[PDB]
Every structure is written in structure tokens, then in C-alpha cells.
């Protein structure tokens, strides 16, 4: 399963 | 921007036997950017309803796609794939050869 | 043996033609198992292998929301990258991300990954330590500084060492019929006259899984420079194909041997043209 990613470039 | 022209292979899923249903594949790979148009052709005419894989990429970031359709090879029918990409001045036509 | 799980993501901007197109797929080894395309009507992540179909509605709901969120953050990130590279709003650009894990035969983490590319070139990558970053250029260093400040690597490490490996293990068990089966290549040599003076010998490998795999020798010497070797290609039925070819003078066919290595084969194969 995937993870979330809250952090923008 | 650096661009990479597609590699192209056109081939069947199973060894060709005249009169027996099979799948005609056009595999395009190693390209960038991802925008690409692919036709499969029967006697020079576009085959309708051709399916393709979802865009994915290799370790080096270059893209690949598989286009495919059911076909029944015969002695005389000619198949090909036509590929257009920004790296090509002219779309590239690769003929199907049952021995490749 | 060893196994891998990968999530691949591509966003492609299209100024004047709405928001970027976002496509993501997941693989275990060389098997596609999930997909999401933002341009589908009411897009959902969809199964692409039988062994994932048993996951319940909460799985699909979470996956779908993650995918939608990623599409949206990629949109913002594409705008950021125009600033970082001093680019105009007129062109199409590409943002790619891969993440996932490799495990050994016993299921322990071998390596984790989380990396990005912009316009087909490395941008930023999590190092093998799962604790530091490699930025490709001064733009990616801006991201690196932000992600160091936010302790991103530690969060990624926790996922890659934990859930990624755990869920891969689960998938390997649920998919044990296929994911834990190697299909050896079916092999043969064909002969293709060029003229009365020479012919091509083509050594075929068909129907194999996984994709990793072909050499010609003449009198026991590798014919690297004189072999045409096509890229391994998908058959469309899980399996792969490859061939290798050499041009052989008439009467010389028995000097040539084709050698095949595949994890599905107990021992490497040696083959010859058999009229």
C-alpha cells in the first residue's frame, strides 16, 4: 500500500 | 530540454500461424517526453479500438508503453505500427515481420 | 528469492488544456497490480492483478484518496519548479516520482527508494541510508533544505522499513501462485536466409517471467559486437520475450551456440540450429 506525502518541493 | 527518441518493436504475442487469432503488439520505450501517438495498421489503414498500457517508466526515467490488439495473421495481410513523437520529423512506420 | 515493490508516478502539465495529467502504477517485481489515471471519469485506483482484488473497500478508498492528493501536490510542485528554473508558463513539463522497497529471500529490507525527476532528469533522491538526500542542482537544493528542516527522510524511512516491507510480504503471500513462480523461457533457434552465402540465426526466448534474462558464441567466444540483441519486451500475458541474432556464413552454423540464463532454468541452456 501507498503512503501519503505532505511535503511540497 | 534533452529528448530521447523511442525504440519501437512490433511483434506478436504468440508465434504467428496463418488463420489463428493472436495479438499484435507495438512496444515503444526509452523515450522522453512522454507525449506519443501510436497507430496499428492493417494494409495501411488504422485499426480501431487498439488498447494500451498505462504510462510507466524505467530506472533511467525514460517512458514505455505497449499498444496491442487482437489480430489473425494471414499470408497476404500486412501489419505495421506508426509512431509519432517530438523527436521525429516524420512519423516512423515499422512493419510487422513474423520472424522478428 | 528477492522481491521488490514500486510505485511510479508521472504528472505532465498542459498549459491551456486544463490541469496536468497524473498517472500512477504499482508493481510487485515485474507484475502490475494497481493503476490510477486522473483523466478517467470519477477516477479510482483500480486493481490489475487477481491477488489484490481481495483487499476491502477501505483499502481502495485510502489508495484513491492518496492518488488524488498526489495529483494535486504534483500540480503545485510543477508550478514551483517553473519558479526554481526560471521557466515560462507556456510549455509542458514532466514530474516523476518513484518509491518502494526491495526485500531479500527471508523478507527483510534490502534497500528503500524515494526519488524524483523533472523533465526527465534527476531532481532529488533519498540516499540508501534513508536519512540524507542527493540534490542534482541548486534548484533541488532548495527542496533539500526544506525537507531537511521538516525531517522528511525520517518519515520516509519509517514507511520504507515498516509498511512497505510488510505490505510487500502480504502481497507475495496472497499472490504466491504467480509472484512466487518463475516461468522459464521456451527457446529455439531459427534460420533466415539472406542469400546463398549467409543467413541469420535467431535465438528466441519466449514466455518467460520475470523479465531478467541471451548470448551467441562462435567457437566459444562471445560475439558481443556482431550480435543484434533486442530489448526484452512484454508479450501482454504477464510474460516477456527476447531474441539475439547473428549473421552466419553458409555451412558454418555448427560453430555457433546460443546461451540462455534465466532464474527459471536450473542450469544455463546451450542451443544450436537444428535443421
Residue numbers in the entry:
A (entry chain C): 1 to 9
B (entry chain B): 0 to 99
C (entry chain A): 1 to 213, 215 to 276
Paste lines from the article:
In humans, not all of the >170 alleles (“subtypes”) of HLA-B*27 are associated with AS: while the prototypical HLA-B*27:05 subtype (B*27:05 in short) is AS-associated, HLA-B*27:09 (in short, B*27:09) is not. Both alleles encode a heavy chain (HC) that associates non-covalently with a light chain, β2-microglobulin (β2m), and a self- or foreign peptide. The B2705 and B2709 complexes are distinguished only by an Asp116His exchange within their HC, located on the floor of the peptide binding groove within the F-pocket. In the present work, we extend the structural analyses of complexes with pGR and related peptides to the B2709 subtype, taking functional studies with CTL from B*27:09+ individuals into account.
The structure of the pGR-B2709 complex exhibited very high resolution of 1.2 Å and was refined to R/Rfree of 0.129/0.149. pGR-B2709 crystallized in space group P21 like B2705 bound to pGR, or both subtypes in complex with the sequence-related pVIPR and pLMP2 peptides. As the calculated electron density map is of excellent quality, two conformations of the pGR Cα-backbone, designated A and B, could readily be assigned, between the two arginine residues at position 6 (p6) and p8, although the overall difference exhibited by both peptide Cα-traces is minimal [root mean square deviation (r.m.s.d.) of 0.2 Å]. From the electron density, the ratio of conformations A to B was estimated to be about 70–30%. In addition to the difference between the Cα-backbones of the peptide, double conformations are also observed for the side chains of four peptide residues, pTrp4, pArg6, pTrp7, and pArg8. When the nona-peptides are neglected, the structures of pGR-B2709 and pGR-B2705 superimpose with an r.m.s.d. of 0.3 Å for the Cα-atoms and must thus be considered virtually identical. Both pGR peptide conformations assume the “p6α” binding mode (i.e., main-chain ϕ/ψ torsion angles in α-helical conformation at p6) in the B2709 subtype. In B2709, pHis5 engages in a direct contact to the backbone carbonyl of pTrp7 and an indirect water-mediated contact to pArg3NE as well as a further indirect interaction to HC residue Asp77 which is located on the α1-helix. The comparison of the newly determined pGR-B2709 structure with those of pVIPR and pLMP2 reveals that pGR is presented by this subtype in a further distinct manner, which is dictated by the presence of the NC conformation. On the basis of these results, the presence of molecular mimicry between pGR, pVIPR, and pLMP2 when displayed by B2709 must be regarded as highly unlikely.
